[PDB]
Design a protein around this ligand. Sequence first.
Ligand SMILES: Cc1cc2nc3c(=O)[nH]c(=O)nc-3n(C[C@H](O)[C@H](O)[C@H](O)COP(=O)(O)OP(=O)(O)OC[C@H]3O[C@@H](n4cnc5c(N)ncnc54)[C@H](O)[C@@H]3O)c2cc1C
Ligand code: FES
Ligand code: FES
Length: 1290
Amino acid sequence: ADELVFFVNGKKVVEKNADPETTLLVYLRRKLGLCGTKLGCGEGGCGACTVMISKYDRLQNKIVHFSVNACLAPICSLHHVAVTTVEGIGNTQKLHPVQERIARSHGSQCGFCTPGIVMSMYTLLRNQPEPTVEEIENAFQGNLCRCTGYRPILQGFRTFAKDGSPSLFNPEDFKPLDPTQEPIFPPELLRLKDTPQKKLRFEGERVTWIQASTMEELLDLKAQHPDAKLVVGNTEIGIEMKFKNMLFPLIVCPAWIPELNSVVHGPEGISFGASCPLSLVESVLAEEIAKLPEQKTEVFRGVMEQLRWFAGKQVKSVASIGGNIITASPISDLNPVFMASGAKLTLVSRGTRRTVRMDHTFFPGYRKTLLRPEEILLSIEIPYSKEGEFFSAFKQASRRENDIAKVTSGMRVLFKPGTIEVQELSLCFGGMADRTISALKTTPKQLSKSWNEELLQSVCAGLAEELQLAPDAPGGMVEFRRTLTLSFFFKFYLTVLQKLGRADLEDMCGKLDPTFASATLLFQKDPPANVQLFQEVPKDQSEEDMVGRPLPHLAANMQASGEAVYCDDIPRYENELSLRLVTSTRAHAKITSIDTSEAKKVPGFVCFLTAEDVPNSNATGLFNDETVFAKDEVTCVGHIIGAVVADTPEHAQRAARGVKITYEDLPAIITIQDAINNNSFYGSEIKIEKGDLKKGFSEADNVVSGELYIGGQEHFYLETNCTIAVPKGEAGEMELFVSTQNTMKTQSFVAKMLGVPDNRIVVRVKRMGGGFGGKETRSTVVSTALALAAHKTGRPVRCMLDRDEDMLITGGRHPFLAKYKVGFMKTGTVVALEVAHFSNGGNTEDLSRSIMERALFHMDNAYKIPNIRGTGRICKTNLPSNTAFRGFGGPQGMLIAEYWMSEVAITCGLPAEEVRRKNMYKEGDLTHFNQKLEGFTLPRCWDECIASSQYLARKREVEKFNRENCWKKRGLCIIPTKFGISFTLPFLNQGGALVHVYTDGSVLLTHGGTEMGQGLHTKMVQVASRALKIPTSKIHISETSTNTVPNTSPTAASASADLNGQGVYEACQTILKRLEPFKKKKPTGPWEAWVMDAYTSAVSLSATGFYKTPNLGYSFETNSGNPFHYFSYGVACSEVEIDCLTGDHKNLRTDIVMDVGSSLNPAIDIGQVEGAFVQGLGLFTMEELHYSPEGSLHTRGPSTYKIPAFGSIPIEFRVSLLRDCPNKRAIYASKAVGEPPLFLASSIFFAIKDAIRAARAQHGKQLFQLDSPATPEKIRNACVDQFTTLCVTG
Ligand SMILES: Cc1cc2nc3c(=O)[nH]c(=O)nc-3n(C[C@H](O)[C@H](O)[C@H](O)COP(=O)(O)OP(=O)(O)OC[C@H]3O[C@@H](n4cnc5c(N)ncnc54)[C@H](O)[C@@H]3O)c2cc1C
Ligand code: FES
Ligand code: FES
């Protein structure tokens, strides 16, 4: 009646008090303690929560398997299914092939996404034990990885496909797959399939769930309670409940009802039950497309095209067709298609049944349909196309707001038979209004007309008038969206001409020029082809000496098995409490009142912490200008005001909603331009200048000025910020488990806030699911709050941020505005450069000044400039404080450099590769800050990359492509980089290690570095194993702790292997020195005997080690002293193809040559080049944050913030590590690698810029603007043509 019964990894679970609000993810993690399955977003975008469901399909009489997002799956929908998690398929004692292959192929860095990807791949193999390469890629459309750049995951998994320097891994050593050895379908569920299913009722704290067994039950419940909210896949309702704080006290799930799941062929088309998952629609229509003649399947193919780039497998397996229709989002991709095809909907209640052909009337208002409150949608008939009936579907792949302002379209034409004269014409659009619309003013005009140029121009003129948007229209991108509607129609117009041509008419139609053909092609991925080149170690190097060898990340197997422990995977103490932050909804305001009266009514509520609860100091942050908790004034949307403490996260979340703040607004400073004209800055102008600007400009042949805007970036570490604080009840003692790159500042900020000495506070980091600089300082806003809750209650307290919280609160990369003026000769030789930089720092200083320093240190990028002036000013604004992000001001400084350089080349009429080459530093040159460039490997990186990329021959093919294609264009660009290695604050260039050798010969090592997926622990073990001359297997690193190594620098500035490697090395030398006498006396006898002899001789088997980078210290005052220990160098050539009509593009090929000295670990270093490059690809081409005019972040999750996906990476992706370039002054001649490759993705940006120019010359001013990121909006709008001109002005 009442019991919930399902299986998890083959074990029966009986839940007697199922709460309808409980997700499967919460149940697995908090009820069953299976923490392999992760929380990444709670929104269905990221796949970190992916698990497999197995059930008996009654309607097909078979056992089916499908993946779902556990974060959105109500347990109440899972009666009598079997769940399989990552723990179900294998472990480190016996890894599944999927697990083994992702680990051994270097497909797991931080490891947080690994379980989810493993389960997506696993599920594919249960459905198709021999998939194509294409099926394998498609399996991950719902899986995001922030670290790997995807290449190693696809390459490792490519071994499962039927259609498949040393090597980074060996596929021959992989255990083969035996599909027979997968776990049995629970026989109990096969026995129960025979029992008839009856109605179930679950009653939660707030919500009642009725699982209906028949159409009669459902319609009865809706007739007596029209308020009953239907839930099917929960992919929309789940979001409304979790993120829009909507509550539906009565839910009915009709997913079991056969009539809602049926597929019926009829004379007019195929009828699908409303609750049919989109994956079933997809599989049914695909069989129909393959079997039926083309003339019948035009609408089917439009549906399939919309479903191609539509969430992943996890969403489509449970997302219902009916759910999509009734949600009635303005940006549904299906509703425009159903509307344009006039699909027939059947609506029923108790005692009524009606039919409506979908038209403009079906959607009368925002998120409304014409259903009555007691009706449900039974079914939708997707029609066969008739003879002379054509359909195209189109969509903007670039989303900015939750549910508006993304163009998506269905388009249909019916011709009078035998003719090219229009009988019917339907053009329907999402993203152009608060509902799906039809262009009903434009289409009637076209009836009778022939399908020709006069129709094209009439429809375009019509759409430009009818689809008007106010310049402040919701969702922005007004010109782009308008342009897309015409551009989509043009594609349809041309596509119809093609189809017409194929039909052998009496009246001849109009032929496409070959240069227009590529305009109608549907997206097609060619076969991936990846190359990784590195250097073999010397032949005489011991097999036990792993330095320079591609040893897998030490945790890779455990990460793939879901056994690796991240903060929130740590079990709860029974007395443990949960914290939830309460943040400002205003950019700048006084707090006038706080009312907690509603918070207090929430079960399990404990307290609301505010400034007045802070024992000692409310002043925190790097430069002591931040509140722990807001006092009288809030200074950004996201400013932490206080913290709810309750028994559970859900109770904390409800209580936080019941904290009402009243505000009195104050003048806000939001943008860089706001800050400039209010003189609102963090300290004074920073400046570097050399030579004589006046003389430089006055002697140049040409001068070019301009401006550039570069948007910021969210880290999107797949593990959000998380802290557990455990008060020990003695002497103010507290222990914190933190996802942080900075144990020292965590400890120090907690101690100061509480007013206790540092020696009472321990911060422990096992690993992070990613960091990328966003946990270098901003993690402490969570730590501090949670430390306070722990102190006040005397109980352990935990807080893991949800994605929307984390993105809003913790800031990101700094946006930059630059104004430049460059003076150059006709040869392209730069003689003068002046750059004013402005950064948007937000509402605390944090690292903003150091970041501006690093931009200024790299404003030269690779180029010697005799006369040069750079200034930087950091803007103070009412925004979340921006912080460190991999590159730390470098990529911003360097993009500006490459931007005016691109204009230098164009202005001169000279090849860009030549202009860059002749301006490049040479060995021994001084930089603008007077540091000498020794071991200047950049020229070799360049020469190698030119040859290996075949750049000159590929330039010719690009030019050829461009002459042959009017509406697609290609671009090709090769970009170098210099990146300075060391913290800009000299004393931070220090590190420590501590080593123990126990009496069994095993070694326990620790150092100040934190693991966040970069393989630092792996490297340090490799180092320790060489230093001590024992195998890696005898050495273990458990974690990083302030009570084993104190006063550590943050894990940052790419320098952690350098600093800690030396520390580790020194501690090992100390141990060796002490073992030397025992070695001498038994030079053969083994390690273990030396150690036991040392012990029983009372010799210390414990040592510290320490290192400081020598001889650093720059003065801005005298422009002297070396800020860097050395420089990293690299070069990337990238090629793109843009679609001039949509602003979409493909990354066709990227070739990278990177100097990492003699790599400690080429697998890991190649991993880092690829990951860094792909994060840069994101910065420069996708990844736009949007803010309201009043400074509220609107982009708070993967629905609206698009980080690179599996499908985003360069189709051919080649990486080489430079041979024979030892770097004497770092550990074992290695170089740092983490940050330097990031900027090389600018090569995709400038290739796009080259493509845009070619498009502009096709129709038909030379230095056009391309801001960063170069999104579809910016690319399309810059591709000026008849459509952009019409939309901007008749
Ligand atoms: C990560 C992600 C990506 C997505 N991407 C896209 C995309 O690219 N394009 C796109 O168009 N959509 C997209 N969606 C939306 C998705 O297609 C819809 O959420 C889904 O189809 C809703 O189906 P459901 O069964 O999950 O509905 P639920 O969330 O269970 O219900 C949705 C609504 O429909 C009502 N309802 C459901 N069935 C019936 C019925 N038979 N009769 C009457 N009312 C009913 C419910 O009461 C509810 O109001 C995305 C969703 C997610 C989570
Ligand atoms: S946590 Fe479920 S999709 Fe991201
Ligand atoms: S390894 Fe994939 S998110 Fe870090």
